[PDB]
């Protein structure tokens, strides 16, 4: 079927990509990087994140597969030595598809973004102060370095370093964590991470400065004259092609405990 392969760009990944293309030539597989039905990422989690955003407008028609030649490879569930077995199983097809929830970010002044890991907000230089509104209800005034809204699969990423909880991706939710919040007699935040279900809307509203540095996964953009930053669980989902059992908690164990 229609497929494409992205590469980290280094020697090991560029070479591995060519061998898989040569192997796919022995089957009824057409290379097409415009409308691929299967996107193969060869590299690290950053490479996989690039492949996702490269095709984030055809997520309902694409199944992703990660091969890690990098260092950690959380979204990758294939080693380079297993590449030929992956080519054959992919050709036969009839695999299983697994879907992870995604995060929608809306910035009004309006631009929308889609995240696989998380979306964070910081100030453009001065102090960061925003009012946190949950479902039109004012919840807190946050003063600190910033805030991080994570997907379930993103909870093992930036969310984890901020003290957030690790969520199983079958839970359609988003998690808000704090970055170095000020808490004294005058300033007060919840402190704890917050896990929101589907259809809950978290809105960040400026207090004084209206310029923020907003990141969505890898890319980070300076936004000016911001009136509102809106977070919610996206209706879109990323789809993985799973050819064997690799449970999320074993993936967590192998990445943080021992492998």
């Amino acid at each position: 079927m229609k497929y494409m392969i992205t590469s980290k760009g280094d020697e090991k990944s560029d070479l591995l990509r060519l061998n898989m293309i040569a192997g796919f030539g022995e089957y009824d597989m057409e290379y097409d990087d415009v409308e691929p039905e299967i996107v193969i990422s060869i590299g690290g989690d950053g490479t996989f994140l690039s492949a996702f955003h490269q095709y984030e407008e055809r997520l309902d028609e694409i199944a992703f597969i990660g091969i890690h030649t990098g260092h950690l490879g959380f979204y990758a569930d294939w080693r380079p030595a297993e590449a030929d077995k992956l080519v054959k199983l992919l050709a036969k097809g009839e695999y299983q598809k697994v879907s992870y929830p995604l995060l929608k970010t809306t910035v009004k002044y309006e631009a929308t973004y889609l995240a696989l890991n998380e979306s964070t907000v910081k100030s453009s230089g001065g102090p960061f102060v925003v009012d946190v509104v949950i479902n039109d209800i004012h919840f807190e005034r946050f003063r600190g370095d910033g805030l991080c809204m994570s997907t379930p699969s993103g909870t093992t990423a930036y969310n984890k370093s901020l003290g957030g909880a690790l969520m199983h991706p079958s839970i359609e939710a988003m998690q808000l964590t704090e970055m170095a919040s000020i808490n004294n007699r005058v300033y007060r935040t919840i402190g704890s991470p917050l896990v929101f279900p589907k259809h809950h809307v978290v809105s960040l509203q400026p207090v004084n400065d209206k310029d923020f540095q907003i990141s969505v996964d890898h890319l980070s953009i300076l936004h000016r004259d911001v009136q509102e930053i809106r977070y919610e669980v996206s209706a879109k989902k990323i789809h993985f092609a799973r050819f064997r059992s690799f449970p999320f908690w074993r993936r967590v164990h192998d990445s943080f405990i021992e492998d």
Copy 2:
């Protein structure tokens, strides 16, 4: 309809209970503490926790209501001055019912328990060492003070003090948090809180000592010759009688930010 009222036992609660019973006498409401359809708790969260466990074998036939004369009152959404308005609205009925997930705890040597807040495990004196098995997969060996498995509505309770995240109760899940885990070159745990969906089973298995102090909400029991402690989201749910809008996040805001 059939109802009963439990009281913290102090003067303000005992007196308030009598006035509500007298007010219910003016309607078609029968007092029955054997098969009540509505259980009213007058006191704090501990009193409400006692009322829940007093009727934990008729949860599918009971709607709970909390009136706080105590200090914090997280499960209570009524002030004592609103008691007469609650009597009338309760008599007319046709309110809305809201369900929160519960935690099932199984201790094999077999006894099962039901928690509204959380269930924790500690050692009976010596060091606490357990293997954490998730869905038959060994995830980690925990060494520390203990572990805490919380319900969604329990995340604002002991779970919060342990650094856990606050979850909305519409999310059918349980959250495992650590108590002072040892982490060095030799010993290693995930550190982060873990949020598990329905049908996931977390099993604690002893390494040396087999005696543990197991708590379920308020009650704490010493268990001997323990072979396994099993956690999972219960199939049973607690039902609340809601007569107005009191969102969970506003309940959180009023309890931790300001009220």
Copy 3:
């Protein structure tokens, strides 16, 4: 004696400053903002921080006094209504002097800085990776948002929001805290805050990118072609003019617990 008064610049502080100058005119007090022996700061902790850096080259000849018209005022131990009593006590003199330790920061490419609160390091855009060398011994490779080295009196400031401990200022030391460190199977940091005594030298050395954003208290400067960032307890100390008992732990209690 020779004195000067700095002001937050708002109406309440500008007016209060003029009244104190008028009151000092009734004594043998000469206003001199070139070589003052007593520097009075009227405003918040940011105003006091500005006054300190304005005279950081005459710290051995200056005693500082803080009057808070702002919001929190941690370095201030005088309310505006007590200003006239402060003028009289200051004129009579013979007060007690109290010294807090300071932090020295050296940036080699060489520039040195002096901090009253803390000095932090972040990346200039890309990922932040530095080797942490303690007394010429390689301790760890840090990957994350950045690092924060705090003075004792600065431990209640940025250091506190990063999970650091609060130290009494009689302890000549500095405290290093982490900002969102990456910790997995591959990357590993100590996690815990580190408290270093006098004459211990903490050195940050770049791994790839050599451009860092270095902050010293309020000011934040972009440094290019950095070869080393060096932290150590300074030999210089800030001196306060104390006219009554205001213990550090009561100052902490009033700022975070209740006042």
Copy 4:
């Protein structure tokens, strides 16, 4: 000189102890476990902790040496294969002595205790509530699982698992850390670890229940009718016999980062 050797009691330690005694027989070294000038501990940190408390009334006349046959061995700076080299260097003598600060705990109803790692307080069953008084000044009312007061060398032990900072042992100080404190609209603690210098006195005073479980390093004792628990840096110090350079931060690196 006069010496004694304590052993973990297992086969490897019991055998290693006999070989060192046989080696010491070739020098002018007299075995004496009543008034030893040098105490050698063969085992883990628990064995070393037992040796310290076994001779805590002759600390000014004893230098300690740790040999680790156990798992981690933080207070040990000798491997079993280096035992013969240790015997020779010990016989020649003229080594360097290094002193670490200790913690004094006073329990009034009066009994005093000496700690090398830490002293902790928990409740005897019910909820733990104590008023924290610092230098006769009421600082906070603590509600939670308990409190932990650590020595400098103990900061890498229980103190570390509670989020406390790691302090260099040249700093004569003690560090108080919290165990799962309750913090809401009504209950409030500092949250942060507190580092106290010499001559500062931290006093815990009961609010309702007067029975506490008090631990000093390994031993844990139930105390009844407690009126006050008093913490302060002890005037006594533990002395180590150091035969080479093993800096504290390298000891920390080897125990937590990699070795």
